[PDB]
């Protein structure tokens, strides 16, 4: 199993990855319909949805196998639950997904 | 449950799906202008051959069968016959029979025939027009235009041989062959059946990854330039492994062995087709040692790294 | 360590290794009367391309690089360069440029070029006679008999597609090509240097077994007949396995799937060839569907059952 | 391991018959083959007959038309039927045996030997 150690944003984040990691991955945040908000990938790849885009920027250290993420120039639309996603990939088998619990911000 | 795999292969020691000759390079450009949906070279990473997609590499683009004479004239009609020499199936579903041409253009190339009965043999000059009204595939006729009108025998063995391409006629400077227009297999406004899908990348700043070569050109000033979406030797790899995928896509990384270094990544879709990061018309610059990798099966989460 | 296997293949389904057509049937005979010694289609099980043998189908028997006009003549001398189209080495350990004929006949096909300023293209029927004084490809030079004395263009990419053989000039019927008498790849009286070996059966009783095609005939009265020792395809995929060999013989089924019996026993010898216990000359007369099962690695102590 | 329990030899008169059996077992795999070789004083060991798990069989030029080899699956045995015995055919027939697989080299055994006498008595 993978658990995650995030961390939380207050009122108007870092979610950290241990366990049966693969070197394989993506990380990045969703929030409540659900919506994603920003995502980076092991190769480097980085994706943002539109709204946070510009303003919000994600980043990882690969080491401690946690990611960040920068939230600024905060707005009203931004309130939310914002729950850490990881996907671990393998050669030989499926994605392996887990959750965090979320944060509400 | 097989592990999934691509061949260890450079680019210059493949082959091109789509016509009989070798892969040269690695081209990516926006495809939104026009339909992709070419039906050789179509083949599922699990190993399914989809549209006229057949294992043979010299296969591609030839004709068999036997030929009728069109009175007066240089011209010739083959009743079709499968790659076997055995009886032709219309009924059978796919667009057409498994390797015939998937552009509209001139294809030149040679027809040959061997009697029978004494083992004399006769070669001329050939050029099938796959946009013509007369081609007609599915339904078993071809045309061909000859430099003879007297010289093939009814009722023998009869092959056609690709060469390259022409443009002739008053069309302009490399307007044709259309490599992304398919030919009408059934003949004039018959519509296609059983057709691989056409292919375009759904993520944005995604672009199709293509597999080129340079068509050998026999007249004119023809566009030479052709794309095909898998190599043939994957298609033959990805048939007999026939290993299952365990999940739409997987994470191709195109390393150099010299250095160990990865140049870039790529996804290959389930459905057989590559998409990279890029945006633009890209002529890639690689390692001539330089191959693909099979990493990891990955989804919508995964991000591909900018080519 | 990784374990041996043979491609889930029918014949068919197959390639010649030793020019561009696909596999027609299976034939054994005795081979005492010629050295059987081909070039081309020649791998170890665990891989290791021998002679001339390169990995793609549609490089055999094709040339690349410029053409000089020989004045006088219908006939062109092409300085060989690689597929890539780079220079061509003449001190690199192999007999002749990878995809050479290993055959002294005439091979017809087309001479293709492009003229590089402004894609203008042209193509015209050729013929090499692999037996000619000026055949000297590992020297780096071949000569072609064409249709013009004009249109070729110097220091510009051309490209000899092969399409069939022929017979001509006073030969005797079926007495040409001749497809085991390697050609002087150097040219007029020279020897030849690092072939694949000869093969031969030894054990008594035994045969080579022949993977065979018919080439296409262009001209007279040829002998169609092409043999080689492995299938393109086994080729490939021994270098893609690269399994390391247990033995020097692994032993082979040939099996029908719809019955699941075994049509006959064969063996596969680690340098590259198949034999089976049959005298004389044999059509094989086999089931659509079959295929070649690699069921273990023996040795001399095990004796195959009489195909 | 792979061991082989052989039979059927002794004292014999000279134009008589004999007939050995070595049957295999333990590590023993479907693709195989079985036989005799022969050892005689200051002699060369010499093959007598083989078979092969696929039918194929192998005689030395010496026993053909006298010596017949035959096999039981069931049994995994193999059988030698000797005829026409003759005072050259004396020696030491050891049973031998291959054990083939797909990933793996030849896994040999033999048997200990037994006499086989040709003379009057």
């Known amino acids: 199993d993978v658990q995650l150690v995030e961390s939380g944003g207050g009122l108007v984040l ?33 994706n943002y949805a539109d709204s946070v885009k510009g303003r919000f920027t994600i980043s990882g250290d690969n080491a401690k196998n946690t990611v960040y993420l920068q939230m600024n120039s905060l707005k009203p639309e931004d309130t939310a639950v914002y729950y850490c996603k990881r996907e671990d990939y393998s050669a030989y088998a499926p994605p392996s997904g887990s959750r965090g619990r979320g944060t509400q911000v | 449950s097989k592990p999934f795999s691509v061949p260890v292969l450079t680019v210059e020691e493949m082959t091109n799906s789509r016509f009989p000759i070798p892969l040269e390079k690695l081209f990516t450009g926006p495809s939104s202008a026009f339909v992709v949906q070419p039906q050789n070279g179509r083949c599922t990473t699990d ?8 294992l043979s590499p010299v296969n591609i ?10 009175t007066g004239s240089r011209n010739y009609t083959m009743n079709l016959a499968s790659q076997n020499w055995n009886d032709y199936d219309p009924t059978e579903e796919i667009p057409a029979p498994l390797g015939t041409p998937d552009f509209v253009g001139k294809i030149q190339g040679v027809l040959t025939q061997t009697t029978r009965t004494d083992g004399s043999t006769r070669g001329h000059k050939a050029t099938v027009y796959t946009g013509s009204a007369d081609f007609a595939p599915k339904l078993g006729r071809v045309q061909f235009e000859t430099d003879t009108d007297r010289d093939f025998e009814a009722n023998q063995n ?52 293509f597999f080129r070569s340079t068509m050998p050109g026999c007249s004119g000033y023809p566009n030479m330039d052709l794309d095909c979406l898998l190599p043939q030797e994957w298609v ?22 010299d250095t160990g270094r990865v140049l870039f990544e790529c996804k290959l879709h389930k459905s057989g087709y590559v998409t990279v990061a890029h945006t633009g018309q890209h002529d890639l610059v690689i390692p001539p040692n330089g191959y693909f990798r099979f990493d990891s099966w990955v989804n919508q989460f995964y991000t591909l790294a900018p080519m």
């Not at chain 1, 990380?27 to 319909?33: A, K, L, S």
Request: aromatic residues 10%; glycine residues 10%; hydrophobic residues 35%.
């Open chain 2, 236 to 257: 033959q790899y990805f048939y007999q492994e026939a290993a299952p995928a365990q999940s739409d896509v997987a994470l191709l990384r195109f390393v150099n062995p």
């Open chain 2, 47 to 54: 190993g399914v051959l989809l549209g006229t997609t057949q």
């Open chain 2, 158 to 209: 009869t092959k056609f041989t690709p060469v390259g391409v022409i443009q002739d006629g008053g069309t302009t400077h490399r307007n044709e062959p259309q490599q992304w227009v398919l030919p009408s297999y059934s003949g004039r406004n018959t519509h296609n059946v059983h057709l691989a899908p056409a292919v375009a990348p759904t993520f944005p700043g995604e672009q199709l990854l």
């Open chain 2, 61 to 70: 683009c030839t004709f068999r069968g036997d030929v009728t004479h069109i």
């Open chain 1, 14 to 46: 870092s979610c950290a990855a241990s366990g049966s990691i693969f070197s394989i991955y993506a990380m990045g945040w969703y929030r409540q319909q659900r919506e994603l908000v920003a995502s980076i990938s092991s190769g480097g790849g980085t």
